[PDB]
């Protein structure tokens, strides 16, 4: 079944790229909320 996982592996590699970039995008949004008087980050 490993070679049948290769047929769909191309769909997962672009998915892990979006998850990589959306988490970098979430991290930069979170860096900006820090300077906004939110005591949750404490």
């Amino acid at each position: 079944t490993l070679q049948s996982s290769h047929i769909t592996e191309w769909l997962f590699t672009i998915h892990d790229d979006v998850k990589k970039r959306a988490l970098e995008c979430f991290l930069e949004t979170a860096k900006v909320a820090l300077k906004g008087r939110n005591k949750k980050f404490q």
Binding site: T1, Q3, S4, I7
Partner: protein, 45 residues
């Protein structure tokens, strides 16, 4: 006396042998394409 006999006729066309012949050719062409690419059906799964 065939008016009280002979049994009932059938409008039967044998399209199922033609449908099976086309299905068997599709498995042949899908197999030849697999061999020329070096990517088996065992190699596809």
């Amino acid at each position: 006396g065939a008016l009280n006999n002979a049994g009932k006729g059938m409008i039967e066309t044998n399209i199922g042998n033609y449908i099976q012949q086309q299905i068997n050719l599709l498995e042949f062409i899908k197999m030849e394409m697999a061999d020329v690419a070096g990517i088996s059906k065992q190699r596809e799964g």
